[PDB]
């Protein structure tokens, strides 16, 4: 009937979904052994009597984190065959993750894909969870998408890429990985959700006011923003939005599908005692530059199209009032080629929380999803980052020694340059 297959590659992908599938089983009330003490069928298959098996696949080339999930808490709900261990890491190389050592894992992973999709009809989408900076996150991350566009060419490959910060990148050959995988990710994905490390670091400092986050605290927020995206899939709402609809109302040209997200409220228990979580203010609190997931200022950008879906007991009347409030605002200057720019998704399910995490509860959670012309700056800093390192061909002998010949570095320059100019010619 209704199902979605989630794919995770890289260490960022495995631990992001380690928080996503924790939050999913927390929603349905199932004990994380697989036993429950019809709406869960989009994320879980039924195997026997009361046993729930996830629709996830775990992929990397380095086995120190797939075996950590295997020996970890979720040993029995996660059946031991969904996880795949590699031989050796791609080691921050697109060429290693795609050409040399990726061939021994892509054959097993695709044999999993068509034997997990042939179980029932009505396959709906894929949730690809990849890190663009990582070598196996972009290497095996790339290699899975053209092979997924060959067999399932008439389906949706939705993506979640953690773009690097301008200052925080935690790798030296990281901008080499980003430039050379985005062009090959471009015409093989159809929806791209770009997040950032330092952006959510700023969020955790400001409104959830921890001085001290870590990667798992990153993973609570991203698991929440994916769950709000999939809220109308699993459960019931007034205006339900499905996977085939996120692209219906955001991507005007096939080239422009890169896109930001945010979430509101992101608060603590002491931060919910004292203020409105009203509909008229959450939309305002999700539109400032201090709230999105990419630290990309849209004040010199131009908003283009946005889904604003809700979850909880919320009525579309004060939703409609909040929409007119945004349109009458002068600072959020929308484009002139569409006076209409909104979708208001809505769902009745109360916002779930993890007991233990600092994200306190509320009866209204709002994920802002937005396509904008502000992407020109976040890719332009990415372009001059490459041009300074490519001045005297730095770090290129690793890639050409792996078998990736000198010369397909170079069209990745003007392909991202052609993408960069696309933002100017749509905003004129």
């Amino acid at each position: 009937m209704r199902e979605v297959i989630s794919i995770h590659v890289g260490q960022a992908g495995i631990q992001i979904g380690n928080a996503c599938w924790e939050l999913f089983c927390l929603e349905h009330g199932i004990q994380p052994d697989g036993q429950m003490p019809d709406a869960f069928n989009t994320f879980f298959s039924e195997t026997g009597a009361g046993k729930h098996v996830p629709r996830c696949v775990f992929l990397d080339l380095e086995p120190t984190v797939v075996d950590e999930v295997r020996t970890g808490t979720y040993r029995h709900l996660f059946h031991p065959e969904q996880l795949i261990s590699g031989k050796e890491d791609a080691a921050n190389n697109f060429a290693r993750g795609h050409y040399t050592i990726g061939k021994e894992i892509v054959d097993l992973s695709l044999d999993r894909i068509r034997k997990l999709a042939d179980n029932c009809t009505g396959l709906q989408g894929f949730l690809m969870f990849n890190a663009v900076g990582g070598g196996t996150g972009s290497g095996l991350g790339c290699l899975l998408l053209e092979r997924l566009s060959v067999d399932y060419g008439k389906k949706s490959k939705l993506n979640f890429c953690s773009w690097p910060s301008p200052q925080v990148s935690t790798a030296v050959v990281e901008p080499y990985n980003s430039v050379l995988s985005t062009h090959s990710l471009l015409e093989h994905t159809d929806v791209a959700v770009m997040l950032d490390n330092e952006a959510i670091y700023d969020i955790c400092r400001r409104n959830l006011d921890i001085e001290r986050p870590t990667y798992t605290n990153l993973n609570r927020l991203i698991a929440q923003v994916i769950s709000s995206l999939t809220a109308s899939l699993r459960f019931d709402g007034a205006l339900n939005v499905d996977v085939t609809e996120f692209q219906t109302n955001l991507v005007p040209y096939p080239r422009i599908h890169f896109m930001l997200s945010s979430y509101a409220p992101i608060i603590s228990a002491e931060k919910a005692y004292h203020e409105q979580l009203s509909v008229a203010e959450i939309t305002n609190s999700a539109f400032e530059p201090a709230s999105m997931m990419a630290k990309c200022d849209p004040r010199h950008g131009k908003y283009m199209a946005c889904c604003l879906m809700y979850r909880g007991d919320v009525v579309p009347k004060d939703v409609n009032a909040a929409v007119a409030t945004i349109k009458t605002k002068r600072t959020i200057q929308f484009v002139d080629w569409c006076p209409t720019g909104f979708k208001c998704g809505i769902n009745y399910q109360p916002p779930t929380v993890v007991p233990g995490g600092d994200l306190a509860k509320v009866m209204r959670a709002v994920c802002m999803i937005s396509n904008s012309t502000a992407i020109a700056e976040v890719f332009s800093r990415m372009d001059h980052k490459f041009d300074l390192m490519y001045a005297k061909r730095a770090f290129v002998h690793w890639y050409v020694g792996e078998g990736m010949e000198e010369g397909e570095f170079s069209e990745a320059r003007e392909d991202l340059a052609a993408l960069e100019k696309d933002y100017e010619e749509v905003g004129i």
């Binding site: 007991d313 009745y348 399910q349 109360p350 009866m363």
Partner: protein, 35 residues
């Protein structure tokens, strides 16, 4: 799911069923024909 009575009656439109009704002495049908 917020299954409380006031919310579920609100989604079920019972409020308009209450206040489109006329709350007075209403049903006037006398048979004027005499034998």
């Amino acid at each position: 799911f917020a299954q409380d009575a006031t919310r579920q009656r609100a989604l079920q439109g019972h409020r308009t069923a209450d206040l489109l009704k006329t709350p007075f002495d209403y049903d006037l049908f006398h048979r004027t024909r005499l034998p």
